[PDB]
């Protein structure tokens, strides 16, 4: 359960080729700016049509 050698740079880069972040959805914010993310509160301290949030 031990390594006999080290890991090369380029094989490590090929290993890290899979490193990628998921794509976050894009949704239009009508009443305010900064178009939001789908199934999230809108930008403007509000879900989208209903305001009940603050950025404190």
């Amino acid at each position: 359960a031990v390594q006999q050698r080290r890991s090369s740079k380029h094989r490590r880069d090929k290993r890290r080729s899979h490193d990628a972040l998921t794509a976050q959805a894009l949704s239009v914010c009508q009443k305010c700016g900064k178009k939001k993310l789908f199934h999230r509160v809108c930008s403007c301290g509000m879900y989208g049509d209903l305001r009940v949030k603050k950025a404190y």
Binding site: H39, R40, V41, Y47, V52, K53
Partner: protein
């Protein structure tokens, strides 16, 4: 292994649910983790339906799912619920509340969501 923290247990989760439903009954809005909110929503709907019957035995039943608060004691909060919360939801079958996703938690990126009232 050796000694450690027990993390979360079913009794611990149900006690947390009791505390959170007590808080939401005191206020009407709770911001928590998505999983906790969606888990507590079903029990909240059950409690609302049981309270809309307006029976003292139902008060005894709901006693075992509430945690006391200085602002709203058990009797005070129960009376408030039976007075102005219960009658509003007789016409609607279920679905007395809505959960809306907030932003993620700073510490652990937990999906925060706010559960609040609707008709």
């Amino acid at each position: 292994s050796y000694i450690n923290k027990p993390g979360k247990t079913s009794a611990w989760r149900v006690m947390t649910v009791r505390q959170q439903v007590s808080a939401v009954l005191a206020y009407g809005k709770i911001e928590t983790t998505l999983k906790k909110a969606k888990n507590t929503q079903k029990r909240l709907d059950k409690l609302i339906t049981l309270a809309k019957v307006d029976n003292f035995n139902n008060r005894r039943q709901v006693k075992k799912w509430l945690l006391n608060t200085n602002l709203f004691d058990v009797d005070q909060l129960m009376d408030h619920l039976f007075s102005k919360v219960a009658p509003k939801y007789e016409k609607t079958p279920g679905g007395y509340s809505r959960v809306l996703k907030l932003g993620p938690r700073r510490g652990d990126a937990t999906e925060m969501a706010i559960l609040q009232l609707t008709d």
